């Protein structure tokens, strides 16, 4: 089997910029190497074919080059919506196999969160539950923290959190942290603050609430 | 136009047996070959077989005989089966149609449709809300936890609200379930005035909820 070999799992790029991403085959395979892209929550999406054709529609800042062992997919000038992952492939000789992807991410200007918290729904208290969530919306860089209080005192190991991939048009990121509680917990404390540490803020900003209040 | 689509078990015991249909429209499978790729969460692509026009199959060595392909040409329907499932085989796997210059590259994928290989039982969600502050943008959202296995999807407002929408990731539980949360800032404005309902979809358990999302 030939192995295709990206040589970066992660590119950095800004939007405006070229960008290019190699691929390298372990034998020769002529011309015939495809490349996809590969956007958050989606299939892959053919660009390229045989090395250097376009497929139908694809934008004309994507192209391929390279024959042999070394080929190089580049994107002229960089889209946000560009954000995903780029794979090569090649269909020189089965098994058809594909390099590992190379994921772009894209710098821009700092951006603070706007940060909210939400209390448990009665709903869930029902069940002996609670979830309390905090959202960090629309910021960059990634880099963030987030610490839960419970009257006033710092949480550890209750909470869990997920980020969401940079935006398609404006290239921040979102944060979800939920803390979780038995119910006869939750209701036997009163404040519930999220308190949040990022670039874009000077000091760490708290949405709290008081259950009940 | 061309589409291709696929349906399938959600979970797979181990050691069980995977059987996945992808229908086609928009072309004939007569004159095209369709091949199954998959892809283990968070990973990369591995090509598994492909079934020609006209019926012949090739597959990957590597999955050691364990899968077949077949197909209703009348019915425009591909059908990936594959035997003895184990953990290697948990992956989301798509059917796509290849280029006609047959090149093995592959111009149209379905939407993919992910197994997950678990002794485990299917649970669905529930789903609760995450109600605007009553203390100008409010976000709002859905919690919708403790099902498994994954995925669920969630609208707003049947697709009517896209814009400042983020669904995170889901976070797997201690107790084996998964949790997610779906939100979206709106105009404070709004919120008198605007309904905000998230819908949720879970295949594998075959759910569907809907929540009205209210300031409380």
């Known amino acids: 089997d030939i192995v295709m070999t990206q040589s970066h799992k992660f590119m950095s790029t800004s939007v405006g910029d070229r960008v290019s991403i190699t691929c390298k085959a372990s034998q020769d395979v002529s011309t015939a190497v495809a490349w996809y892209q590969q956007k958050p929550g989606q299939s892959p999406k053919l660009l390229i074919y045989s090395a250097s054709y376009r497929y139908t529609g694809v934008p004309d800042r994507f192209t391929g080059s390279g024959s042999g062992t070394d080929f190089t997919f580049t994107i002229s000038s960089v889209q946000a919506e560009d954000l995903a992952v780029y794979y090569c492939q090649q269909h020189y000789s089965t098994p058809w196999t594909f390099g590992g992807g190379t994921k772009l991410e894209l710098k821009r200007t700092v951006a603070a969160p706007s940060v909210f918290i939400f209390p448990p729904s009665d709903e869930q208290l029902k069940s002996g539950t609670a979830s309390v969530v905090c959202l960090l919306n629309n910021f960059y860089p990634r880099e963030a923290k987030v610490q839960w209080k419970v009257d006033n005192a710092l949480q550890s190991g209750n909470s869990q959190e997920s980020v969401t991939e940079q935006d398609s048009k404006d290239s921040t990121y979102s944060l979800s942290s939920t803390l979780t509680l038995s119910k006869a917990d939750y209701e036997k404390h009163k404040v519930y603050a999220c308190e949040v540490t990022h670039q874009g803020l000077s000091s760490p900003v708290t949405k709290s609430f008081n259950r009940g209040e | 136009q061309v589409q291709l689509k696929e349906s399938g078990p959600g979970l797979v015991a181990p050691s069980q047996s995977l059987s996945i249909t992808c229908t086609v429209s928009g072309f004939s499978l007569s004159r095209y070959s369709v091949h199954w790729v998959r892809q283990p969460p968070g990973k990369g692509l591995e090509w598994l077989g492909m079934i020609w026009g006209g019926g012949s199959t090739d597959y990957n060595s590597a999955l050691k005989s364990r899968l077949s392909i077949s197909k209703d040409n009348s019915k425009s329907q591909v059908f990936l089966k594959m035997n003895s499932l184990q953990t290697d085989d948990t992956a989301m796997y798509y059917c796509?149609?290849?280029?006609?210059?047959?090149?093995?590259?592959?111009?149209?994928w379905g939407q993919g449709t992910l197994v997950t290989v678990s002794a485990a039982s299917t649970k669905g969600p529930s789903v609760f809300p995450l109600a605007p502050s009553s203390k100008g943008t409010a976000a709002l959202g859905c919690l919708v936890k403790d099902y498994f296995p994954e995925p669920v999807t969630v609208s707003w407002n049947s697709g009517a609200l896209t814009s400042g929408v983020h669904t995170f990731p889901a976070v797997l539980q201690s107790s084996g379930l998964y949790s997610l949360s779906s939100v979206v800032t709106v105009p404070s404005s709004s919120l008198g005035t605007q309904t905000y309902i998230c819908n949720v979809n879970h295949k594998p358990s075959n759910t569907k909820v809907d929540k009205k999302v209210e300031p409380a």
């Open positions: 796509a149609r290849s280029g006609v210059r047959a090149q093995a590259w592959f111009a149209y």
